[PDB]
Amino acid sequence: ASKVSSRLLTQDILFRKDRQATISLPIKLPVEDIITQTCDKITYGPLKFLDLLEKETAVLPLSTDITCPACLGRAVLVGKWECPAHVAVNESDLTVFGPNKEEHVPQFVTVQQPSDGKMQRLFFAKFLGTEESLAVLRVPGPDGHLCIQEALIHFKELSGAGVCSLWKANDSREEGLEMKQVDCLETTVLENQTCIATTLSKKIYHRLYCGERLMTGGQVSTRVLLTALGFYKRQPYTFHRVPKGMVYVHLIDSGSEDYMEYSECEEVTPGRYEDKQISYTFYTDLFQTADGEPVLASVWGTSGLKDSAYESCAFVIPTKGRRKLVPRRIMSKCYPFRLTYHPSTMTVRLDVRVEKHHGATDQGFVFLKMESGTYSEGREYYLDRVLW
Ligand SMILES: *[C@@H]1O[C@H](CO)[C@@H](O[C@@H]2O[C@H](CO)[C@@H](O)[C@H](O)[C@H]2NC(C)=O)[C@H](O)[C@H]1NC(C)=O
């Protein structure tokens, strides 16, 4: 425990007053108020730039953590702009891009920070993409990076959960995000293709289960992004859907990880069937780690069959105060899932609503993650019923 780096990414689970609150565009609130009102969880990290294709470049994940890789979500990037006196960079020198949004000068606003009353210059952009998507910031010169004090990413998951990240220049967590240019190994697909490896390291004790068999665990969650930056090759006299300006493409890992190292899971996870639903229970000490702070529960599933029909819900579970240990649903209704906790026995119960048929052509999948600031538990469930 003592030997783990103290300079990695960390996260807080938050307890917002109004779980129906949303970000309004154009931005009219300071960053901290946006977080207060619309974030259910926040990850802290360092804002870093590399000199790439002749500008200072930052590459940020829309979500640092794995919950639902294929699920679509909406992200809002909000950055603080304040150039030192000696640096001569215009707001128009900053561009950003991300999924669903071409390279562009972001929209700028001025807001008043009610805390200290000070004025603040912010820029923002809205993206639509999966969890694995990226936001890329570009600014020129050697001093351009000094104008961006911090960047907030608010990722609204399919569940409605607000999963946020705050990247500050000179954040203490300097080992939490590392970026380095690497040689491109596969055949080029972009003009002026430039490959970057981004290693995300978070100090959090994570465990992954299938039912109640432990698949993997550790003190540090590590994720490596391999990203190609460059420009789409545009054929003469041809309309292309791909936008102009700089883009990115995801690259595959060098060593294929298309195997299951942990093959000891049952093909159908043990549970209690009631024909109307399957119920799973397990013991956890998670709520004893919470440090008086909430636990965030994210659950999603897919019946298989469908190419990309995902069901997702999220719950905030405070561990002190009114109705403590009672899950608060983040969106209005969660039809597929019910989550309940029995403090006396320290037992969670997950109910999965399912349809009638049961004995053929079924490959349902459910993932439940429950996390505090310092612990996370993921649990995979393999169904032989079709999910509602
Ligand atoms: C690689 O270097 C530069 C990249 O800056 C390429 O020139 C253009 O750069 C501007 C931005 O400064 C981009 O808007 C253009 O997209 C770049 N040109 C093209 C065709 O993409 C330069 O052309 C590239 N050099 C080589 C040999 O390909």
308 and 243 in a common domain: no
* Secondary-structure breakdown of the chain: helix, strand, coil percentages, each rounded to the nearest 5: 5, 50, 50
Query: Are 10 and 64 contacting, i.e. CB atoms less than 8 angstroms apart?
Result: no
Query: Are 247 and 231 contacting, i.e. CB atoms less than 8 angstroms apart?
Result: yes
Query: Are 216 and 208 contacting, i.e. CB atoms less than 8 angstroms apart?
Result: yes
Write out the residue range of the structural domain in which residue 331 sits: 204-218+260-388
Method for structure elucidation: X-ray
Tell the residue nearest (CA) to atom 10 of ligand 1. 245
With vertex at residue 304, the alpha carbon angle to CA 301 and CA 308, rounded to the nearest 5 degrees, is 75
Tell the residue nearest (CA) to atom 13 of ligand 1. 245
**Cα 61 to middle of ligand 1, angstroms:** 25
Q: Token pair of 133, please?
A: 């998507």
What is the atom index within ligand 1 of the atom nearest the CA of 244? 16
**Cα 192 to middle of ligand 1, angstroms:** 7
309 and 232 in a common domain: no
Total domain count, the chain: 2
**Cα 270 to middle of ligand 1, angstroms:** 57
Tell the residue nearest (CA) to atom 20 of ligand 1. 191
Tell the residue nearest (CA) to atom 14 of ligand 1. 245
- Residue 43 pairs in a beta bridge with 11, 165
Q: What letter represents residue 74's amino acid?
A: R
DSSP code string of 204-225: EEEEEEETTEEEEEEEEEEEEE
Give dist(CA 88, CA 104) in Å, integer: 20
> Could you tell me which of 208, 369, 385 has the C-alpha nearest to residue 279?
385
357 and 239 in a common domain: no
Give dist(CA 311, CA 300) in Å, integer: 5
**Cα 65 to middle of ligand 1, angstroms:** 34
Contacts of 144 (CB under 8 A, 6+ apart): 49, 55, 56, 87, 89, 93, 94
249 and 212 in a common domain: no
Give dist(CA 38, CA 21) in Å, integer: 6
378 and 340 in a common domain: yes
> Could you tell me which of 13, 1, 125 has the C-alpha nearest to residue 65?
13
Tell the residue nearest (CA) to atom 27 of ligand 1. 192
| Whole-number CA gyration radius for the chain | 22
Query: Are 386 and 365 contacting, i.e. CB atoms less than 8 angstroms apart?
Result: no
What is the atom index within ligand 1 of the atom nearest the CA of 231? 21
Tell the residue nearest (CA) to atom 6 of ligand 1. 192
User: Is 375 in a helix, a strand, or coil?
Assistant: strand
How do 277-283 and 272-273 pair as beta strands? Answer: antiparallel
149 and 58 in a common domain: yes
Mutate to test the pocket of ligand 1, among 55, 192, 246 (most ligand atoms within 8 A of CB): 192
**Cα 382 to middle of ligand 1, angstroms:** 49
Contacts of 372 (CB under 8 A, 6+ apart): 13, 286, 287, 289, 290, 291, 293, 294, 295
Query: Are 128 and 74 contacting, i.e. CB atoms less than 8 angstroms apart?
Result: yes
172 and 75 in a common domain: yes
Give dist(CA 206, CA 220) in Å, integer: 7
Tell the residue nearest (CA) to atom 1 of ligand 1. 192
227 and 286 in a common domain: no
Query: Are 294 and 319 contacting, i.e. CB atoms less than 8 angstroms apart?
Result: yes
Give dist(CA 375, CA 388) in Å, integer: 30
**Cα 88 to middle of ligand 1, angstroms:** 24
Put residue 188 in one of left, alpha, beta given phi > 0 → left and psi -120 to 50 → alpha: beta
**Cα 246 to middle of ligand 1, angstroms:** 10
Q: Please count the residues of the chain.
A: 388
List residues near ligand 1 (CB under 6 A). 53-54, 191-192, 231
95 and 232 in a common domain: yes
**Cα 185 to middle of ligand 1, angstroms:** 21
What is the atom index within ligand 1 of the atom nearest the CA of 246? 16
271 and 228 in a common domain: no
Query: Are 273 and 381 contacting, i.e. CB atoms less than 8 angstroms apart?
Result: no
With vertex at residue 47, the alpha carbon angle to CA 116 and CA 24, rounded to the nearest 5 degrees, is 55
What is the atom index within ligand 1 of the atom nearest the CA of 192? 1
User: Is 330 in a helix, a strand, or coil?
Assistant: coil
Mutate to test the pocket of ligand 1, among 52, 54, 191 (most ligand atoms within 8 A of CB): 191
**Cα 181 to middle of ligand 1, angstroms:** 18
Burial environment of residue 93 by CB neighbours within 10 A (0 to 12, 13 to 18, 19 or more): middle
**Cα 101 to middle of ligand 1, angstroms:** 20
Query: Are 323 and 341 contacting, i.e. CB atoms less than 8 angstroms apart?
Result: no
383 and 363 in a common domain: yes
Classify each residue of 55-64 as buried b or exposed e, where b means 16 or more C-beta atoms within 10 Å of its C-beta.
bbbbbbbbbb
Query: Are 161 and 296 contacting, i.e. CB atoms less than 8 angstroms apart?
Result: yes
DSSP code string of 86-138: T----GGG-EEEETTEEEEPPEEEEEE-TTT--EEEEEEEEEEEETT-EEEEE
**Cα 330 to middle of ligand 1, angstroms:** 46
312 and 297 in a common domain: yes
Beta-carbon count within 10 A of 154 CB: 26
